[model samples]
Target: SIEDTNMASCITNKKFVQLEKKFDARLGVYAIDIGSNKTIAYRPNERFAYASTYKVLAAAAVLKKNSIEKLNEVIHYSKDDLVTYSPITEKHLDTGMSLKEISEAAIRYSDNTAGNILLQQLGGPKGFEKSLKQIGDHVTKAKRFETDLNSAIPGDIRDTSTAKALATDLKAFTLDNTLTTDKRMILTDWMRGNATGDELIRAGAPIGWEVGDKSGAGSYGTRNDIAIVWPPNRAPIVVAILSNRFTKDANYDNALIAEAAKVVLNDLK
Candidate 1:
């Protein structure tokens, strides 16, 4: 539990304090060192809008039932499939991409259309909901596709999960018996190459460290980043930072996330 004395001490570090005081947003953070089983958290059990970070689970479910080769099975898109916040819709509309390519787009680009394509491939909201439950994420729910531009409105809750639940799911990716090693590597590799949230978790990392992560940005001030951070000469740490308030300023939220990550990474050393 995060109430453990050592974990308590860890969350009170100066960097974390700075993050807590930087803004008035509701914040939740969970970080764990798998090697030592040590944890640090703040409001970790509280649920917040999960945003595109849920794509990780969607990809995992798809891979569980299909092969990496299945990603190569191309599918086409039409004008109706277009959605906002997706480079795929803008650049590849009416074109064809394999399930694998769409999955990569979802992870690396956080493309809404790509994510919807994957969701359709996996059976839709109900299928994803079942997958979430199967993986022990009782607190999280995938309700709709990212297609609706208005779905992410500040007060509109799309998908929701707690920081602890996300961290647990990420840890499971490393050990879930249903996921093959090759598929796991494929997901991790795609995450490692993710192109978004550069100023969030990735910015806070120490040089020589590596991070594989997925980030989410929702309308009306929801910014989140969930990551597996590998510190140089140290063990990997799983971290999830979720923030919700109405500032709608990604810069502010990202700065807070970076500072929070700095606190967690420094503690690992």
Candidate 2:
């Protein structure tokens, strides 16, 4: 029999309180676990810029069009295909790579150049916009050419979406049977390589579990992470957090998101 997983007292966890006190997060949060089918929310419906988190969707769009095998085909990167503000790109590497390689780099390295390349593979801006809309009605728009380099005013980005909406899309991505298990595994594994700001959720997970997720930051008002944690003997959990504090410190804001996950995990019954 399945143990009752309802977190009746999740809010009582001390970690949650500590995180709230430590971080100045002021945005939205949403999470769900398929194993126990548990979920939690705080201002989840509010919209905020997705930042690099949008790349995950773009990846999904590409996967939807091509087979995982075909995705292995190599593609070279060019300066004309580059995007700004990303910490990684083909320039950072010594050689050209395949679609799978670039996707891994895009998530693991958070490469905007690779992201733009994948965007191109997905049929460019117009194609990405159309596919994204089909995946989720609330995604609403796409801004491919624009990037998010931290300039005096911040570079142009695709736009924003509600935490709830992103969560809903994640659920679709995970549960959709149309995708082969291998394809799902490929994307999920790559998500584990996310190495950007606010190492919140990953830090809070149990010692034995492996976490697959992504994080994004923009200017003074954007911090986001979408993750899947594999706990022992439990169904995987999905956590998506989007925050804006109008401050330079993104890690500080992400601390709140991490604490929330701990509250949910430690308090699971």
Candidate 3:
């Protein structure tokens, strides 16, 4: 139906409908063509559980509030700080970790303890929220820390924001000039070597394109990947692709998000 709205998504809109039926999930897509100033979206304003994708923004927010020197300071945490899927921080518990290393763990591995400890340094979710607002993002909110914010309940609104709103924030980190140059590169680098998103956005990106992204998964089969993608010789693009199944405990299919990502990427090019 969005094809009738007069934007650039006629074919992809149809593909999105078919994908929704095939995957049995609600999919949200929002992409900005930085070169052409073209934008296309579906359910761009609807709330959905954002999962670890929030880590990217959280990383950006922390850098905004602290001097780059702060990243070199040591941060200590113990067994009490650990949570599910804390592979990175778990290994360093006895020795403690630096702020830079903790940020890499949280951004690259979606490390639970690393994310929480990073929050510990920032004072908690409110710190992220306050910094988010200061950066002009009034839509995104984080009420709880890792694992708790990943609930992904069917109708719940907690820990959710629209893909469009997220893309706006992501563009600033990727190619736009919202944050300082040094900190922007730091956040983007953390997202570049991420281990969790191989089969999602990266799977469908063009052969020569480079993708810097963060992913999240949770209850009710919710899965999300948001990124700043660079297509060869052109201005980079920003894409926010988020999805969740209708069934409570379904397993996430990699192809669903990948195909949707391909659709947006192909359509824009």
Candidate 4:
């Protein structure tokens, strides 16, 4: 018989064994206690292409190099910046915007054009890659305008990063006290309003609990979600989910991703 006191027992005691069974999820998760330096993880170091979640990194790189006051620096939109089927970005065509506003649009709305333009301002695609590497991300390869505009799977356009690295960077962004209070607040607030619909993190959270997260899907066969759950009086918990599978139905895939997030959230609560 299996021992009663084991990892299985710990999971079951947390009311998460059922979740493990119900979702049948292949996940990479890492949780931390920034105050205590306590950590728990499963496949926390696995590498996975970050998809649009890379935008968060881009946002950070831009902010790290410029002052928030420079948000008004004008950036023009070109046809190369155009992405099909994105209504929100198409509307801003030929118009110029400040870097700050563009960065906000990139993260808040996941606007491809806004991100691309920032790429241009950063001295083109090569600049973006240099910026990420400067922050210690082992970005194997990255390119501007490489991500699929109409992505429903993962692995599109020159984008790649590990799940462990992505989550680690996010943890550093969230809990590492080295970041200025203003920068920390800015990043957290931006993540809290990420443009991906609320179906995943929102699904398992209580009515009033605050959840801040990001989701990505692309033609390269990928689906992922990263979130931070801040319970009213408890230490914050982070969740990172990544998957790759060919599918004709994105809606269905999103549902599965949402269920996985719910399982994690339920376990934490």
Candidate 5:
């Protein structure tokens, strides 16, 4: 029952039309009602840079194969392991922390270094890709670490995803048995307390709603946010919003996501 919900007509909705007018970006959006099995999408299959959001899949992959006790095993980092935008590396460089701690940083703080560390533990990008493929996500691909953010050309191989693919995978995070219940709890808790992208999806959540989310930001004006929103007296809603080809104005991009979230939240309500 994941059929149309008149989402194709969203471009004509007054609020969506207004949002499009102000959003100077290539956008992809997908939302699903878990209870009803209904879906709404716009450019859902359009791919964009995955950015740090790919960490969600990486975390899932790691959790699938490792136990919490195993995750608590200590790991060391060298200066070479440090990368930009990593609070973990900033504070723990040349020191050690548990893989569990590192994964938390990767998800909660969007730490680039921690993400690379986990990717290494998972046998690199291909390993993570295989894990995703097993979970029915065939379109996402991760080829490099976050440090490549500065070295790569605009179109170079990097982590990429489509809204539809991401939405499906996120739904799996909640519904599939791929990860143990405890592991799923850990990931979702980290996402619920995620510290980045405050102005994105969470910005649009209505009062009393609970939102668990992960966000992504990247070079070339890519910005994204995905979330499972729990409304009081209603089933959870999954939403993914991806944008590219916009200006580097983080505030503007955040507003775009908030607007999209508002539209989706309204439709669901």
Candidate 6:
């Protein structure tokens, strides 16, 4: 048995060590049980490329800033506004998507165009900072657009967050009253059935547990998933698993994140 008073001293296991070596990467983990504040972490304070995971905060900002009816307001944009991997926005060019639809697309599909649109609604990345501050998160930040954030050159600090910071942020919005129940559920609903993140947090969670997560990927093989997961008859847990390889152009290992997630879950119990 270990102590929780010093969250800095977290439980470490061979599984994460092996996974990091197998993927040629460094892994960051932060997991906390909401009910008891039981935590376990590795590299909790180091920054990692945030990538599409920012979409969750973007969605939260939109929900926080707008009224429920504002969700029905549709936004139209040109093909020129589109960026790479914009699966949903590219198709909606003709019809335009509502705030609700675009927000969903950003989190659910990791749609770059949808993410940018949400950023625009918030007045670009600057607006995102405001949202973070409002949520009492000074550690997580975004200073660039979607495409630029995705650059994720190894060692570049832009668009990065410490695993501890992100996990803490996740804990705030998901379980606390920082967001009204109605507003928060919109974001959670979008996240629960997300089109991305199948093999990361979802695969690693105990069977029968439900998860609402946002996943991210970037250069240097950066892969991340942050989630609020519910275990049967227990309060939810918030976990963030962020990993990155040393070499450029390396591929992200889904299995590594999955296995580490399993380790996080087991340790939480």
Best by lDDT: 6
Scanning candidate 1 in windows of ten residues, the lowest lDDT window is 148-157
Cα lDDT of model 6 by residue, 1-93, tens digit: 335534324335556777788888999999999888888888899889888888888888888889878988988899999999999999989
TM-score of candidate 2 on Cα atoms, chains taken together:
0.79
Q: Which residue runs does candidate 4 get wrong by more than 4 Å?
A: 1-26, 35-40, 124-126, 139-141, 144-146, 149-158, 247-252
Give the runs in model 1 whose Cα sits over 4 Å from its true position: 1-18, 147-158, 247-252
Whole-model lDDT per candidate: 0.77, 0.66, 0.84, 0.62, 0.79, 0.86
Candidate 2 residue spans exceeding 4 A from truth: 1-22, 85-88, 91-95, 144-146, 149-158, 247-253, 267-269
Clashing pairs in 3: none
Residue 27, candidate 3: how far off, in angstroms? 0.4
**Model 5 pairs whose backbones collide:** none
| TM-score leaderboard ranking | 3, 6, 5, 1, 2, 4
User: How many pairs of residues collide in each model?
Assistant: 1, 1, 0, 11, 0, 0
Residue 67 lDDT in model 4? Answer: 75
Q: TM-scores, in order shown?
A: 0.88, 0.79, 0.94, 0.78, 0.90, 0.94
Best by TM-score: 3
- Candidate 5's residue-wise lDDT over 1-269, tens digit each? 22454543554255654676687666788999999987768788867877877787788788887877898888978877787788876687656878888878888889899899888888888888888898888898778767664222345555777898998898787556767888888878888856585889889989888888899877667778988899999988999988765444333368888888888887778
RMSD of each: 2.9, 4.5, 2.2, 4.2, 2.9, 2.2
lDDT (10s digit) by residue, model 2, range 208-256: 8767777777766576777777788877777787766645544445666
lDDT tens per residue, model 3, 101-178: 888888999998887876666678877777777768898877888889888887787788889988988886667777
- By lDDT rank, best first, the candidates go 6, 3, 5, 1, 2, 4
lDDT tens digits, residue span 123-218, model 1 = 887688788778788887667777543244555545778899998988787545667888888888888856686888888889988888899877
Error of 3 at 153 (Å): 0.8
* lDDT (10s digit) by residue, model 4, range 111-212: 777767777767776787787677676643565463543353343435555556676667766666635788778878888855484866656666666778
Error of 2 at 11 (Å): 3.6
